[PDB]
Symmetry: C2
Amino acid sequence: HVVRKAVFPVAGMGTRFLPATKAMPKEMLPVVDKPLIQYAVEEAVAAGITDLIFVTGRNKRAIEDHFDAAPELETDLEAKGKHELLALVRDILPAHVNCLYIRQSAPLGLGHAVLTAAPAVGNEPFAVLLADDLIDADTPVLKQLIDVAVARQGSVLGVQEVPREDTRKYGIVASQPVDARTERVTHIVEKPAPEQAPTTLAVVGRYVLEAAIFDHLRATIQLTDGIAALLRERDVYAHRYDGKRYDCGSKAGMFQATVALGRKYHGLIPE
Amino acid sequence: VVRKAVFPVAGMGTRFLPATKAMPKEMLPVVDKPLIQYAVEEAVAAGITDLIFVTGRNKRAIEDHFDAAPELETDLEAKGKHELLALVRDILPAHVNCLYIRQSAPLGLGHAVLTAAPAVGNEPFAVLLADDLIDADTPVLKQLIDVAVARQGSVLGVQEVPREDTRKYGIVASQPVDARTERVTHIVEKPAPEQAPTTLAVVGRYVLEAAIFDHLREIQLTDGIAALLRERDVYAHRYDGKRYDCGSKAGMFQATVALGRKYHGLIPE
Ligand SMILES: O=c1ccn([C@@H]2O[C@H](COP(=O)(O)OP(=O)(O)O[C@H]3O[C@H](CO)[C@@H](O)[C@H](O)[C@H]3O)[C@@H](O)[C@H]2O)c(=O)[nH]1
Ligand SMILES: O=c1ccn([C@@H]2O[C@H](COP(=O)(O)OP(=O)(O)O[C@H]3O[C@H](CO)[C@@H](O)[C@H](O)[C@H]3O)[C@@H](O)[C@H]2O)c(=O)[nH]1
Ligand SMILES: [Mg+2]
């Protein structure tokens, strides 16, 4: 089991952040001075990912230009002696990491975006990271999940408990415990009503998936329904990662991430 | 009489890298809206119909924001999301137009303004710097335009600043003509505190007569305004409104907090 490829779906419409997402993916919005997608990419690279796969939509321009070289910007900075800032631009990706881009044909859903990556993944297990789940963790959450996936020989979903009123926001798993932090998944259901949700254990935007998922995404698109079918055929585990998740998919969550991370890592204090 | 506005949108925002690697500084959002869109909405609210964007790196970030995107409108309308479709169409109101001109190189605000001359022609025009995010009950540009038409001259938006801050601003020497407006007799660019003639600073709002263009053919805007002073009337106006200096991370944060509260109900936990 070797997980070296990561898929970043960044092709959604971003309607909760209009007008800012008119011509920019939601994942390119900054938290202070860094786009959401760069936090997630940095986490993946720290977890041993070498092959980055960006699934883009009509707003691909900003994602491409963020991770590709900007020789004109580097020329300027280099000329003005700003070697400090030069690294912020050219060293976003270390040299042992590569990226590629695949355009999702239409915004047909997260499951369809993951399936769109199949030509670059092949028959390899792979990571999926949803950058609007911004996670502050002392050990990269993706690394935590990859270690479980290697040890237990299966797919792994990052999960954490949520208030029962919040189940309508998330995929919710039914499972049976395996150790303190890990459970074997017996069902997953997307955004159930709180009165119907089988548990309050919710999927965060971090996945390690066996390539078997792709055939199920063809016969499904919602990613959660592909996973629920994968269950019937292979092992899927849910892991309670250590870390603080900010749900930046809403204006409110992004705001509280700016406040909390602004304070902790930048000393930004509300007046 | 003022219906054209120039928006320099070439900011490198080096203090905001890597966020500004792929978009100009003026595209960064405060809550859910790019800085440039606050400034454009202020201009449109003041009767501006012709938007003139002076671009630099990542020019299509600005263009794709303001240009219609039929693909997006087609998808929203098909999903019955009619409030969101109207929001997207209001980014550029139907009576408003915009055009794009490239700055040849980063030669300062004065060069950027001069770059807009072919689009402005001989009429008076506004300049708005999107990093100065101003929240006011009456649009600040409207306040300045009203003064310009009344007094038949150019108008600089000003506010008092700490003397220790004058190296950040253009500073005006001037004589009161009414409670909020002064007649400018001199302007100096970013003086040392110990040599600043006053503490009355120009913020990023201008209403300028087209005569400025010949005086800029002087690379700094303050030097152009000082030459314009020898031939035409220039006033400074203490606008009413709260300015957020979004040129620093600290200032942009205070704008997110304050406007988050006022316009979106968002309260720090
Ligand atoms: O056509 C599309 C639609 C979405 N996206 C991307 O998909 C992600 C978000 O998809 P969306 O379906 O809006 O996600 P959520 O509603 O937050 O729910 C997902 O993410 C949650 C974790 O945040 C999980 O609990 C849910 O099970 C899972 O479906 C983002 O990366 C988007 O860029 C695409 O690339 N293409
Ligand atoms: O080569 C350049 C430099 C700047 N800009 C744009 O011009 C504005 C800011 O220019 P800069 O000269 O860096 O502004 P400040 O240092 O804030 O000073 C200007 O703005 C102040 C108000 O904030 C005034 O007091 C000053 O007189 C005036 O020079 C932004 O819209 C930039 O995108 C360009 O397009 N090209
Ligand atoms: Mg989300």
